[PDB]
PDB file of C-alpha atoms and ligand atoms in Angstrom:
ATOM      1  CA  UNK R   1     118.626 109.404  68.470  1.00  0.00           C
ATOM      2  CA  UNK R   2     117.964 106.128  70.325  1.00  0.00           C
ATOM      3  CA  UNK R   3     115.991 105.410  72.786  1.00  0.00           C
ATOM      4  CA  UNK R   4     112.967 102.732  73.617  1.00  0.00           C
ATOM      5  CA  UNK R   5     109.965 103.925  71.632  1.00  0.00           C
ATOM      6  CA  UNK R   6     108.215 102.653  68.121  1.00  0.00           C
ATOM      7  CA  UNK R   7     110.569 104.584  66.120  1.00  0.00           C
ATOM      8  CA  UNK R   8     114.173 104.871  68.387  1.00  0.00           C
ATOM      9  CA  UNK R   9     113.947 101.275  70.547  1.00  0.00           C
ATOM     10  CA  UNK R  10     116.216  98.376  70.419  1.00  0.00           C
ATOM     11  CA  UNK R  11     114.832  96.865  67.022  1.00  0.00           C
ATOM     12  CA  UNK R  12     116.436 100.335  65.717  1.00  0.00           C
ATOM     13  CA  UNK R  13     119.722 100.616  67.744  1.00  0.00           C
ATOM     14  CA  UNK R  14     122.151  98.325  65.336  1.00  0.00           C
ATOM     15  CA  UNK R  15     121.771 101.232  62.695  1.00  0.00           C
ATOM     16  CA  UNK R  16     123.854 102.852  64.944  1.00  0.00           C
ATOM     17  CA  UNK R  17     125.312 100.377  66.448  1.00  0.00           C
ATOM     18  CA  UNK R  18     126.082  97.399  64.519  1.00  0.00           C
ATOM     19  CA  UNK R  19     127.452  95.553  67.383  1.00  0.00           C
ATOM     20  CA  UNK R  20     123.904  95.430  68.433  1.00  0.00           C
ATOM     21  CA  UNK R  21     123.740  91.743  66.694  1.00  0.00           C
ATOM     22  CA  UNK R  22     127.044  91.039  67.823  1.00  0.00           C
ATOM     23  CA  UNK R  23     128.446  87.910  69.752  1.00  0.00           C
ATOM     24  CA  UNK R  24     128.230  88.865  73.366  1.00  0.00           C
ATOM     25  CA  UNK R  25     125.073  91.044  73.140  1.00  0.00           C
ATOM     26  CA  UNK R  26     123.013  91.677  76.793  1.00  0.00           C
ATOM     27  CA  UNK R  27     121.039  90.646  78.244  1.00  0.00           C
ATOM     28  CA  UNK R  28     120.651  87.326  77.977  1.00  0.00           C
ATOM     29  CA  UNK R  29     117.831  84.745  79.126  1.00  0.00           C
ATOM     30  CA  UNK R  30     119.059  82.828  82.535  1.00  0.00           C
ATOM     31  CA  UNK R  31     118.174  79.032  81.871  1.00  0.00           C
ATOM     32  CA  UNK R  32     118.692  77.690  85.067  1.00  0.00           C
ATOM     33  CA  UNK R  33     118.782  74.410  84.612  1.00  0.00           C
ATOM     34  CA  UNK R  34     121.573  74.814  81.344  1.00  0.00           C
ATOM     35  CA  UNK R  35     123.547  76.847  83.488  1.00  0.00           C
ATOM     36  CA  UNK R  36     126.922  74.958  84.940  1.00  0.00           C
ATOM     37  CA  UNK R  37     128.020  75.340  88.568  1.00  0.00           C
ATOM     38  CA  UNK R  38     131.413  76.203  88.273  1.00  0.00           C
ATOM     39  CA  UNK R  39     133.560  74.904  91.550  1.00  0.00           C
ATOM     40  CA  UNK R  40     136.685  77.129  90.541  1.00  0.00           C
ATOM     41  CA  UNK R  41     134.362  80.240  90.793  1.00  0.00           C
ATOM     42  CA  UNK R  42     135.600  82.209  94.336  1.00  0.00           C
ATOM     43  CA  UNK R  43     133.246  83.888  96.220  1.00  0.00           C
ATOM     44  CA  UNK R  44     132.354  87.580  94.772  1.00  0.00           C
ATOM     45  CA  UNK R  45     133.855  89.953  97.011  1.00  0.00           C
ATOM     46  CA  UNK R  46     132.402  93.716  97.538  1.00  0.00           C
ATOM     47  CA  UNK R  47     133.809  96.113  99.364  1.00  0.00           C
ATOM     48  CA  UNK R  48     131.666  98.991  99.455  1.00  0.00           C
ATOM     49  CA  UNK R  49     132.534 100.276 103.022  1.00  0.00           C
ATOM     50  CA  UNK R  50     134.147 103.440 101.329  1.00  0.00           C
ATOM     51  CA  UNK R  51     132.232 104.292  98.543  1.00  0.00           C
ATOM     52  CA  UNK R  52     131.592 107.981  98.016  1.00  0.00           C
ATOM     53  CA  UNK R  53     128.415 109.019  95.920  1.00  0.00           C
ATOM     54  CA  UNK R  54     128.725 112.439  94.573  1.00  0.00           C
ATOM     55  CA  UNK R  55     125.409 113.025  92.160  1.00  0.00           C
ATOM     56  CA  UNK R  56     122.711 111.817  90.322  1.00  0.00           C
ATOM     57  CA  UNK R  57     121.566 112.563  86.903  1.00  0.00           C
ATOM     58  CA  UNK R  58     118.559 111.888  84.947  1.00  0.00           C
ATOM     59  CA  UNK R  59     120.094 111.074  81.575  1.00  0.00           C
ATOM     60  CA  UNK R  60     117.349 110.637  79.501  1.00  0.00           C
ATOM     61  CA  UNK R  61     117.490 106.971  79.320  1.00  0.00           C
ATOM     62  CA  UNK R  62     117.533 105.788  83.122  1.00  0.00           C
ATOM     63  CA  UNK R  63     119.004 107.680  86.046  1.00  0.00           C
ATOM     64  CA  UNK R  64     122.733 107.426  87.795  1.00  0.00           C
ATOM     65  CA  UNK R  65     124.166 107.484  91.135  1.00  0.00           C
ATOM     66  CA  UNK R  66     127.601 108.312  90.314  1.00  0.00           C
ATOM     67  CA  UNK R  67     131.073 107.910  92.606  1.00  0.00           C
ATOM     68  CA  UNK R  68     134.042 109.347  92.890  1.00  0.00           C
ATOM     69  CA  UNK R  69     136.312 106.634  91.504  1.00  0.00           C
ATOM     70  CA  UNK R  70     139.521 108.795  91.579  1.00  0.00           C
ATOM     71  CA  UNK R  71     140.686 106.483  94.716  1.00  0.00           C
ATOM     72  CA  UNK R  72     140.762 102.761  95.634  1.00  0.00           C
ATOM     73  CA  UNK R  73     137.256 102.773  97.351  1.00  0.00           C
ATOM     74  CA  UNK R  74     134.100 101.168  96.523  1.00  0.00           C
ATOM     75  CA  UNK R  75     135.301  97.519  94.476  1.00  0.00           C
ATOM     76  CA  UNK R  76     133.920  94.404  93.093  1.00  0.00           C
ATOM     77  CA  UNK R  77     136.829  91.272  93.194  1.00  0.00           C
ATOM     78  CA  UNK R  78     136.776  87.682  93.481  1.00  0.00           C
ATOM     79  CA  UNK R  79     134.235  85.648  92.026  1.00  0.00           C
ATOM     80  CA  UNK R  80     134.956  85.392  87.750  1.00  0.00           C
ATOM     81  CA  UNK R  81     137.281  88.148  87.649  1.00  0.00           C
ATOM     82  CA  UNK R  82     140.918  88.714  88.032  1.00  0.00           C
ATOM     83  CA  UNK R  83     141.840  91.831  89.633  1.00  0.00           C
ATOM     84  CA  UNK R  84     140.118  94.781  90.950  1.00  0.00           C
ATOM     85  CA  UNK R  85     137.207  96.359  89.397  1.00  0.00           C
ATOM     86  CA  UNK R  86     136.253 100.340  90.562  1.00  0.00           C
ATOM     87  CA  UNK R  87     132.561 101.014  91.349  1.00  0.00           C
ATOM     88  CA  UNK R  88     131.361 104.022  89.054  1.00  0.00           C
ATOM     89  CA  UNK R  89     127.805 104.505  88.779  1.00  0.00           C
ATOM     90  CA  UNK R  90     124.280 102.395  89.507  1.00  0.00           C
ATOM     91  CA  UNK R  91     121.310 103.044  87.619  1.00  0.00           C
ATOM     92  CA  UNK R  92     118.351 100.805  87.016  1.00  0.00           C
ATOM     93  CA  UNK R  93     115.833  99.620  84.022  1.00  0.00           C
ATOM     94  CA  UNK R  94     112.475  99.138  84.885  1.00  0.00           C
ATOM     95  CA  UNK R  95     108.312  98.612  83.381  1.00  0.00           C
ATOM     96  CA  UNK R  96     105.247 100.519  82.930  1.00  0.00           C
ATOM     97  CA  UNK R  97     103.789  97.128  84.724  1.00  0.00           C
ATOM     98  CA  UNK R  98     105.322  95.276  87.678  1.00  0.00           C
ATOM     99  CA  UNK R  99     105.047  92.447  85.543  1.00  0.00           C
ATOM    100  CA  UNK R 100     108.070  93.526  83.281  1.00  0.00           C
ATOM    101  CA  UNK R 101     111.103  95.980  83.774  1.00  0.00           C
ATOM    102  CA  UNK R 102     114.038  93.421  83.909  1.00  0.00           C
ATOM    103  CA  UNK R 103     116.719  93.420  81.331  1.00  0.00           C
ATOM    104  CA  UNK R 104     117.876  89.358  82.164  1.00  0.00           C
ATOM    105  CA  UNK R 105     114.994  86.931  82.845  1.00  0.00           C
ATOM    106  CA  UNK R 106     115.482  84.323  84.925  1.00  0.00           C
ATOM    107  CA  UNK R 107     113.414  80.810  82.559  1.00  0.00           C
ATOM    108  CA  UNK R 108     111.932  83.765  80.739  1.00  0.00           C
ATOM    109  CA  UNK R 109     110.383  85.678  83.936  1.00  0.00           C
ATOM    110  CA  UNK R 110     110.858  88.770  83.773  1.00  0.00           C
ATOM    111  CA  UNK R 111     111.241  91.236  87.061  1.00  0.00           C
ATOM    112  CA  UNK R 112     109.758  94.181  87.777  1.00  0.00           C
ATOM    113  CA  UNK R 113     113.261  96.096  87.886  1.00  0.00           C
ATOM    114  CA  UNK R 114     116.834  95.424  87.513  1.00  0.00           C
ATOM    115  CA  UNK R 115     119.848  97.048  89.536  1.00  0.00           C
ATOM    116  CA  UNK R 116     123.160  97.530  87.632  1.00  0.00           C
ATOM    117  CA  UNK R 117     126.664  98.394  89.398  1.00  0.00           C
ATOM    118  CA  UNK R 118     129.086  99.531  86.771  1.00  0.00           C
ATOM    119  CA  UNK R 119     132.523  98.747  87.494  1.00  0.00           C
ATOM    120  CA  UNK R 120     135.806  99.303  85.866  1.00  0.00           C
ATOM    121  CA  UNK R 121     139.215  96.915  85.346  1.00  0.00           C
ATOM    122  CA  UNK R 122     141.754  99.568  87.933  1.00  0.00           C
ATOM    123  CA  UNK R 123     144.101  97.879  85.154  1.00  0.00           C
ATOM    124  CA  UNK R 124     143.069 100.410  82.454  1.00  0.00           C
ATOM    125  CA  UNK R 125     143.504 103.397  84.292  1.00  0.00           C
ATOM    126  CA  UNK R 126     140.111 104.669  83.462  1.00  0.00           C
ATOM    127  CA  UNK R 127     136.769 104.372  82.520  1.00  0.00           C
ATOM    128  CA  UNK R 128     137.284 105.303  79.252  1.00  0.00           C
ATOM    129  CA  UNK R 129     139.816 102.923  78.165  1.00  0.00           C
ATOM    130  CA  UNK R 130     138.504 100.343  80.394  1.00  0.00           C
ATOM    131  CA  UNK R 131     135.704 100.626  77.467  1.00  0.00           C
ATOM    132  CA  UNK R 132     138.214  99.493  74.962  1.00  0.00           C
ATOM    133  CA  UNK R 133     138.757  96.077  76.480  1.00  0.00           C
ATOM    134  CA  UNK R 134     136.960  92.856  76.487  1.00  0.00           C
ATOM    135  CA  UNK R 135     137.589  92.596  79.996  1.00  0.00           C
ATOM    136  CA  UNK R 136     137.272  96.123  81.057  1.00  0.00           C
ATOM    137  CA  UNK R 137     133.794  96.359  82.601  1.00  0.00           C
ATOM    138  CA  UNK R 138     132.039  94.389  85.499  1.00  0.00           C
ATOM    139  CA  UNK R 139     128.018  95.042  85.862  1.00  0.00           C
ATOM    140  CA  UNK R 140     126.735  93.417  89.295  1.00  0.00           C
ATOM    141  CA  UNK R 141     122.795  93.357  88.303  1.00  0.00           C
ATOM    142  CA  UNK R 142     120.099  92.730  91.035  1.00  0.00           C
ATOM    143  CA  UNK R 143     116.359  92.181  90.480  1.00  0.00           C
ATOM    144  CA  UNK R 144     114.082  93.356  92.317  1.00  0.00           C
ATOM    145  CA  UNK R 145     110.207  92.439  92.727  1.00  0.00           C
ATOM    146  CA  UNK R 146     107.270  94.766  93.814  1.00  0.00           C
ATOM    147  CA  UNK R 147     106.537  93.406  98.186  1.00  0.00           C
ATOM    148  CA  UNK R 148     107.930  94.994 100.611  1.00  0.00           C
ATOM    149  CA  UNK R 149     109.654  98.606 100.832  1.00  0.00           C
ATOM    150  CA  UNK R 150     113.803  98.441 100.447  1.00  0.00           C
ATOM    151  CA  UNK R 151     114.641 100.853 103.180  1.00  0.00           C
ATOM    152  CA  UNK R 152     117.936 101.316 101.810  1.00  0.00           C
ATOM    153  CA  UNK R 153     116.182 102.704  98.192  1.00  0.00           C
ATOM    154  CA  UNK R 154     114.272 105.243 100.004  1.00  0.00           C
ATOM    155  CA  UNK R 155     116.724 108.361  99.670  1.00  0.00           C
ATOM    156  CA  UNK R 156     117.062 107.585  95.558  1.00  0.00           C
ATOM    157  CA  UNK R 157     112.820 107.519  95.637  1.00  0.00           C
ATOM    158  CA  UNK R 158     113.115 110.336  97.359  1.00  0.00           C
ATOM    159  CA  UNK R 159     115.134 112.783  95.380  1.00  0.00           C
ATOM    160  CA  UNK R 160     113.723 111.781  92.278  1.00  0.00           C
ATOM    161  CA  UNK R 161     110.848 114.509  92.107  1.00  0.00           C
ATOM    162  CA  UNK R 162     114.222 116.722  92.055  1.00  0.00           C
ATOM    163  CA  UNK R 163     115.661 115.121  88.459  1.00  0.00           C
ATOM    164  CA  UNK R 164     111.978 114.458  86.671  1.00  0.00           C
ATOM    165  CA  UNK R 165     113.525 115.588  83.139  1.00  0.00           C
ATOM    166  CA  UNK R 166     116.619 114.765  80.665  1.00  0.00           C
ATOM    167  CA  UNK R 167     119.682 116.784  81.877  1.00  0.00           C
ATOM    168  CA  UNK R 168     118.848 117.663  85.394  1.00  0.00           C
ATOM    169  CA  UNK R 169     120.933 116.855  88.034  1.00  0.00           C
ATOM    170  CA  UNK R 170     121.424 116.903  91.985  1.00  0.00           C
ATOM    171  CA  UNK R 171     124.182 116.840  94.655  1.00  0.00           C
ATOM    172  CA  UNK R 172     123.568 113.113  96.072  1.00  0.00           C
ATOM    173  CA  UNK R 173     126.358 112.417  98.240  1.00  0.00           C
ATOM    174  CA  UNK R 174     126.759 110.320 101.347  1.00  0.00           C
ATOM    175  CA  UNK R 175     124.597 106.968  99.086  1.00  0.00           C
ATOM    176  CA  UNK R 176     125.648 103.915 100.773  1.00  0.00           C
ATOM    177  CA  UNK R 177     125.157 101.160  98.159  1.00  0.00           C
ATOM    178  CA  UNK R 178     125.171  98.007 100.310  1.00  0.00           C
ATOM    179  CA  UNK R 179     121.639  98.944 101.203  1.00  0.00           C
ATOM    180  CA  UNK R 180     120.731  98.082  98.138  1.00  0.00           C
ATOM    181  CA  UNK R 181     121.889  94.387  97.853  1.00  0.00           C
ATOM    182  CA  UNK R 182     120.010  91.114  98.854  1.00  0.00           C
ATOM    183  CA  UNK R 183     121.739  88.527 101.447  1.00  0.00           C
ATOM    184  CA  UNK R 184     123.243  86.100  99.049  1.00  0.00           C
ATOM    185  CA  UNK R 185     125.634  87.078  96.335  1.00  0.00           C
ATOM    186  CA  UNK R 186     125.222  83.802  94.786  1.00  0.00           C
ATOM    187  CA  UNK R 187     125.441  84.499  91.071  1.00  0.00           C
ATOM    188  CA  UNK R 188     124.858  83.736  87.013  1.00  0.00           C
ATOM    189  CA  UNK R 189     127.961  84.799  85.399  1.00  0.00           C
ATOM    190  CA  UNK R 190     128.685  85.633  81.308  1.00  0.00           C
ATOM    191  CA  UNK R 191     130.545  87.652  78.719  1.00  0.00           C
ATOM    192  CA  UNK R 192     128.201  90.261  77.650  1.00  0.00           C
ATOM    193  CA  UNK R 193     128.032  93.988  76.698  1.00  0.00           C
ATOM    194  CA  UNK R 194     126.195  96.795  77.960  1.00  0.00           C
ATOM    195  CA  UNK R 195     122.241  97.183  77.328  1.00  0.00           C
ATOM    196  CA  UNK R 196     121.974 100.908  76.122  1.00  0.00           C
ATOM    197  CA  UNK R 197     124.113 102.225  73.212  1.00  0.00           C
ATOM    198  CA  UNK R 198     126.843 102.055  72.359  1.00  0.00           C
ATOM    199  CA  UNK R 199     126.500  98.095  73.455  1.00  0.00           C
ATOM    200  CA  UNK R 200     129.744  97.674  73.911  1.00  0.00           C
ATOM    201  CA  UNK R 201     131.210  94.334  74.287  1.00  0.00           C
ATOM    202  CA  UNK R 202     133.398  94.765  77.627  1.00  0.00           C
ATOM    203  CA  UNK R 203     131.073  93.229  80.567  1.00  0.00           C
ATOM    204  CA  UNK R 204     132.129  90.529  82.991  1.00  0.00           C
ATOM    205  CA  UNK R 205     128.361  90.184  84.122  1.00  0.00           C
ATOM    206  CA  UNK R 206     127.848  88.922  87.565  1.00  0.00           C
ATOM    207  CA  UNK R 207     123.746  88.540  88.534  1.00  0.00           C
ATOM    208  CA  UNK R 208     122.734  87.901  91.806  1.00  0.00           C
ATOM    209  CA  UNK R 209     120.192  84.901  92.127  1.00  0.00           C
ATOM    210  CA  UNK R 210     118.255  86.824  94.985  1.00  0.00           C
ATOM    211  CA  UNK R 211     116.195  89.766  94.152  1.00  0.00           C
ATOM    212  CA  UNK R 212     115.490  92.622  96.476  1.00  0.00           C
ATOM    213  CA  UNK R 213     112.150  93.738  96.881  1.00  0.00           C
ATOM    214  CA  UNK R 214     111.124  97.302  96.834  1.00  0.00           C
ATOM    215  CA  UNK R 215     107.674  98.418  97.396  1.00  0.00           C
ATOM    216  CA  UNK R 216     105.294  99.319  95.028  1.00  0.00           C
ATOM    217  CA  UNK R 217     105.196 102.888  96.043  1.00  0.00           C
ATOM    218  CA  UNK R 218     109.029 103.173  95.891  1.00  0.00           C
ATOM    219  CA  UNK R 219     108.743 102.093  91.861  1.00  0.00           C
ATOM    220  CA  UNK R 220     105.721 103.826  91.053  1.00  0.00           C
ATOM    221  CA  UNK R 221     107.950 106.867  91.777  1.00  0.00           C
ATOM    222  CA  UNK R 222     110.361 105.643  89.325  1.00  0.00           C
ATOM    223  CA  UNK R 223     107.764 105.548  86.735  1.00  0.00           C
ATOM    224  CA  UNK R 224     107.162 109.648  87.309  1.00  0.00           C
ATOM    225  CA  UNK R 225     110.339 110.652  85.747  1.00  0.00           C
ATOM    226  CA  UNK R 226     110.385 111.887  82.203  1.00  0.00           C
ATOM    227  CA  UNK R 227     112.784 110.481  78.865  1.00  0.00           C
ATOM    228  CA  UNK R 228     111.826 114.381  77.646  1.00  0.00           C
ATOM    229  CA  UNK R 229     113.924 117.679  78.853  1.00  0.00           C
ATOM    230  CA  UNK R 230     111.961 120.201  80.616  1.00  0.00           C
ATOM    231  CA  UNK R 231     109.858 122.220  78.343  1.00  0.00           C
ATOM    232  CA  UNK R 232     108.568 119.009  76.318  1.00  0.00           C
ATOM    233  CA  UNK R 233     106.028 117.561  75.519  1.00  0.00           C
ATOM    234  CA  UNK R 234     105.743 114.713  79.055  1.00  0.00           C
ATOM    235  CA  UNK R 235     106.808 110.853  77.798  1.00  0.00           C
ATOM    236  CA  UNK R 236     106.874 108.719  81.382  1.00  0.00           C
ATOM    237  CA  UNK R 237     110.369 106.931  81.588  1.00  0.00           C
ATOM    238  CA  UNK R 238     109.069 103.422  81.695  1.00  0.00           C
ATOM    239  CA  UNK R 239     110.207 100.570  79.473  1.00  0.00           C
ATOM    240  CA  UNK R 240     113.673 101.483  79.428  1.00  0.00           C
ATOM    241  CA  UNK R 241     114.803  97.522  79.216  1.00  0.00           C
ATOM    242  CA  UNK R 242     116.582  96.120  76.057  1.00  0.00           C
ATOM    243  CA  UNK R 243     114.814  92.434  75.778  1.00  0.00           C
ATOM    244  CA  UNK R 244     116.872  89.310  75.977  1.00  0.00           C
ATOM    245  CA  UNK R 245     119.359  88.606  73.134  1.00  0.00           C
ATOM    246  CA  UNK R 246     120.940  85.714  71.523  1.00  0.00           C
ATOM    247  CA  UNK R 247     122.975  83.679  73.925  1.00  0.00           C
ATOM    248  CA  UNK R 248     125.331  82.339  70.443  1.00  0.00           C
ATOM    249  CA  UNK R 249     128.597  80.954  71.630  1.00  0.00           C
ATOM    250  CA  UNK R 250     128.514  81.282  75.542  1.00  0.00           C
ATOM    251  CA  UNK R 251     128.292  79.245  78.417  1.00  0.00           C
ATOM    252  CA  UNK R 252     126.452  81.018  81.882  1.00  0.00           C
ATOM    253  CA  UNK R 253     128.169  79.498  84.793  1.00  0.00           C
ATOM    254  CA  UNK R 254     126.653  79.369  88.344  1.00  0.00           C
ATOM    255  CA  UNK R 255     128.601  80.116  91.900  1.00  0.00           C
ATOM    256  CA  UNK R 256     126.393  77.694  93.566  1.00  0.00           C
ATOM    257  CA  UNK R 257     125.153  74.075  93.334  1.00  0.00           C
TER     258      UNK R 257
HETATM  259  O1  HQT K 301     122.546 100.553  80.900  1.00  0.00           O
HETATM  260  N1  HQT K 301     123.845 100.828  80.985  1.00  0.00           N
HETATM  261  C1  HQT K 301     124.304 102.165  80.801  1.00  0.00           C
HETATM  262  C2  HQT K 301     125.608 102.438  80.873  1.00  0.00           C
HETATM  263  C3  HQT K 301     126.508 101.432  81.137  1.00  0.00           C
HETATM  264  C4  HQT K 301     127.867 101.718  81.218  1.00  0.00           C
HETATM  265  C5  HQT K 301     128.789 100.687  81.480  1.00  0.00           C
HETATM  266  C6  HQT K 301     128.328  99.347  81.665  1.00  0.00           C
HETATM  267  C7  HQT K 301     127.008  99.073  81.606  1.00  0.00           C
HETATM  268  C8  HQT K 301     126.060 100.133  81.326  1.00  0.00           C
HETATM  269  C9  HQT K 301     124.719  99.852  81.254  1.00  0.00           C
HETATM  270  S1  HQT K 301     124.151  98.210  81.501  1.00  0.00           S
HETATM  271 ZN1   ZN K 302     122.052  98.986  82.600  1.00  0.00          ZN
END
């Protein structure tokens, strides 16, 4: 099945998945320079004062903090998108090397991590048909660079030793997520689709121009989980980015001049 070795890794996935060399594949490279402020853009707008964490799961490919999104509680509005957009899980993708790790590059630097909020349209009801529209989905993706510690990441470092392999899981409630994002929430913004299987094209992508940092001890830790299930042979969960894709027919648009 897929993943991101020799054998299973994104040069593999559009067996699978054909939409893999679709039209609005992710990531994409960030040129800066080719990238239009857009004036009409509003400012991006979230509201994560009630968000509920319940659990996070090592699922073989990355990890998740997941939320209870059966209320109106943690949301993402404003900015490119119409409506109201329900926060249901953050998970990351990061290297083997502080030099790589992020899925969008910013004039082809890459960072050592990447942050992605996963959001659903409230218009579809649900997560799963939310995944059935072009507009269904809105990822807010951070960076983040190895300097100093993000105290706010500490209790995810922490309970990681608790979810090393494929499968396992672990009450994680009580997460506040704005601890995790920078001071601006000036932002890149592009049709795209998600990175992992099944790519699909639904993703109002919003990426912060501000990384966070986190400290190398707090992503070596990442590093120490496992792709494998318990009882297998020990493959490090590093590398899980999908490199930068095709930009085709889009235009990246910029909240700020
Ligand atoms: O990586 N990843 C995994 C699951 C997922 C689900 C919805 C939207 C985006 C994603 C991503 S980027
Ligand atoms: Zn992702």
């Amino acid at each position: 099945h897929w993943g991101y070795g020799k054998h299973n890794g994104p040069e593999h996935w559009h067996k699978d998945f054909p939409i893999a060399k679709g039209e609005r594949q992710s990531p994409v490279d960030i040129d800066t320079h080719t990238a239009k402020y857009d004036p009409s853009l509003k400012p991006l707008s979230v509201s994560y004062d009630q968000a509920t964490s319940l659990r996070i799961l090592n699922n073989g490919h990355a990890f998740n903090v997941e939320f209870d999104d059966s209320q109106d509680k943690a949301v993402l509005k404003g900015g490119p998108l119409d409506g109201t957009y329900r926060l249901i899980q953050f998970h990351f993708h990061w290297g083997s090397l502080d030099g790589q790790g992020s899925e969008h590059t910013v004039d082809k630097k890459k960072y050592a991590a990447e942050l992605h909020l996963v959001h659903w349209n409230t218009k579809y009801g649900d997560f799963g048909k939310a995944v059935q529209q072009p507009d269904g989905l809105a990822v807010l993706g951070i960076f983040l660079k190895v300097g100093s510690a993000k105290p706010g990441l500490q209790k995810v470092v922490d309970v990681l030793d608790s979810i090393k392999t494929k499968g396992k899981s672990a009450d994680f409630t009580n997460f506040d997520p704005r601890g995790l994002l920078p001071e601006s929430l000036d932002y890149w913004t592009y049709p795209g689709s998600l990175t992992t299987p099944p790519l699909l094209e639904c993703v109002t992508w919003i990426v912060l121009k501000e990384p966070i940092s986190v400290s190398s001890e707090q992503v070596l830790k990442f590093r120490k989980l496992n792709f494998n299930g318990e009882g297998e042979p020990e493959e490090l969960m590093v590398d899980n980015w999908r490199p930068a894709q095709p930009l085709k027919n889009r235009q990246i648009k910029a909240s700020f001049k």
